[PDB]
Amino acid sequence: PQVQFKLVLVGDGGTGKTTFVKRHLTGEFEKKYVATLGVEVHPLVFHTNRGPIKFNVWDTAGQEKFGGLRDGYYIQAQCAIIMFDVTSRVTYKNVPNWHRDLVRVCENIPIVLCGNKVDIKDRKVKAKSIVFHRKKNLQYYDISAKSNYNFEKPFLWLARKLIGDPNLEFVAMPALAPPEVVMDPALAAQYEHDLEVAQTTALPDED
Amino acid sequence: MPEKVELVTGEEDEKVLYSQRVKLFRFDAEVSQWKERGLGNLKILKNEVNGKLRMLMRREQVLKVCANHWITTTMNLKPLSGSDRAWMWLASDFSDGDAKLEQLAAKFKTPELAEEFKQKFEECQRLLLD
Numbered sequence: 614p615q616v617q618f619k620l621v622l623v624g625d626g627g628t629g630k631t632t633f634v635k636r637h638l639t640g641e642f643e644k645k646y647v648a649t650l651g652v653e654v655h656p657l658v659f660h661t662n663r664g665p666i667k668f669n670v671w672d673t674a675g676q677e678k679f680g681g682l683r684d685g686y687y688i689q690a691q692c693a694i695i696m697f698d699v700t701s702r703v704t705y706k707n708v709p710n711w712h713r714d715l716v717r718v719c720e721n722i723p724i725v726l727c728g729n730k731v732d733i734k735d736r737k738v739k740a741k742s743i744v745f746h747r748k749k750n751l752q753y754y755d756i757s758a759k760s761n762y763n764f765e766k767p768f769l770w771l772a773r774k775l776i777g778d779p780n781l782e783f784v785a786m787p788a789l790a791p792p793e794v795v796m797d798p799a800l801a802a803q804y805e806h807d808l809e810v811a812q813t814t815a816l817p818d819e820d
Numbered sequence: 821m822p823e824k825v826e827l828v829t830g831e832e833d834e835k836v837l838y839s840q841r842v843k844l845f846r847f848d849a850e851v852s853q854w855k856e857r858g859l860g861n862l863k864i865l866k867n868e869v870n871g872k873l874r875m876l877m878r879r880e881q882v883l884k885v886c887a888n889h890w891i892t893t894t895m896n897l898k899p900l901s902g903s904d905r906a907w908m909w910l911a912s913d914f915s916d917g918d919a920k921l922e923q924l925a926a927k928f929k930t931p932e933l934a935e936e937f938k939q940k941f942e943e944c945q946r947l948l949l950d
């Protein structure tokens with residue numbers, strides 16, 4: 614009897630939606646821009662003091678080439694994230710359109726607004742320009758998938774609204790004891806050889 | 821709404837022998853890239869009831885497990901060419917509740933802290949031979 618919630622993730626192309634999801638899933642940061650084609654659903658579990666909750670995140674394609682009937686992917690949605698890029702004014706100019714499209718299908722669902730890429734110093738959308746959330750009573754956050762700044766806040770806020778507990782807390786994931794099965798020395802030696810290139814491959818943080 | 825639950829860490833029987841903030845990486849052999857795995861406290865834990873030693877680490881903010889494996893004598897901390905404060909090693913990891921063979925690496929704040937970890941990790945390995 615799991616506590617699930619459908620979450621639609623929308624925004625102009627290049628705003629960092631897929632990078633945001635991957636960061637939450639594996640902790641990685643993808644530097645390449647590979648445009649999302651269609652819609653990809655990803656379960657994201659968070660552990661709370663009231664139990665685990667699962668966000669089935671519908672990662673969408675921001676490009677308008679895929680907007681013929683995008684409304685259908687919002688049906689049965691229970692929350693949503695609108696994402697824009699603070700280094701690209703066009704992405705914020707289109708927020709009202711994203712918000713309009715959502716409410717037309719889902720009406721009163723909790724929706725978070727995320728200004729991504731705040732790690733970059735040359736911020737083209739200034740903080741005083743961001744006003745659409747006040748207008749619609751949405752929760753806003755500056756986030757950075759690259760620096761992890763506030764990148765968990767949208768889910769914490771949505772979890773509190775959906776569960777109806779403003780004191781909900783994300784808590785440490787239980788870490789059960791591993792099984793007794795471990796790598797035998799021969800297999801370990803086989804992988805040290807197969808994966809030797811890893812020893813001479815740079816870490817991405819070296820940047 | 822769902823009722824409040826007992827907070828279970830899975831560490832109640834354990835004692836911290838070492839804890840240091842690190843950045844954890846995991847090698848993706850499909851693309852031959854190191855990928856950031858998380859940022860948080862890498863711990864060596866000793867279970868006080870059965871004496872077992874394991875590595876444990878949770879990601880900050882999301883608070884999810886990114887390293888969870890028994891320390892074995894087979895593990896060999898090796899340096900990486902691109903860092904003066906990092907080690908790599910192989911482990912059967914249980915972060916996601918499923919055993920996974922993973923190529924990991926941890927980067928420390930300074931080379932002294934990395935050497936300190938290596939000395940502590942290999943002291944534990946030697947105790948396992950006893």
Ligand SMILES: Nc1nc2c(ncn2[C@@H]2O[C@H](COP(=O)(O)OP(=O)(O)NP(=O)(O)O)[C@@H](O)[C@H]2O)c(=O)[nH]1
Pocket residue numbers: 624625626627628629630631632633643644645646647648649650673674675676729730731732733756757758759760
């Ligand atoms: N500096 C910085 N770059 C970021 C951040 N998030 C994403 N990027 C970069 O932004 C680019 C586009 O990211 P991506 O996740 O593909 O965006 P998207 O919003 O899913 N695009 P689409 O809707 O076409 O599928 C990537 O090359 C990625 O490295 C961030 O927080 N900071």
Ligand SMILES: [Mg+2]
Pocket residue numbers: 630631632647648649672673674
């Ligand atoms: Mg995408």
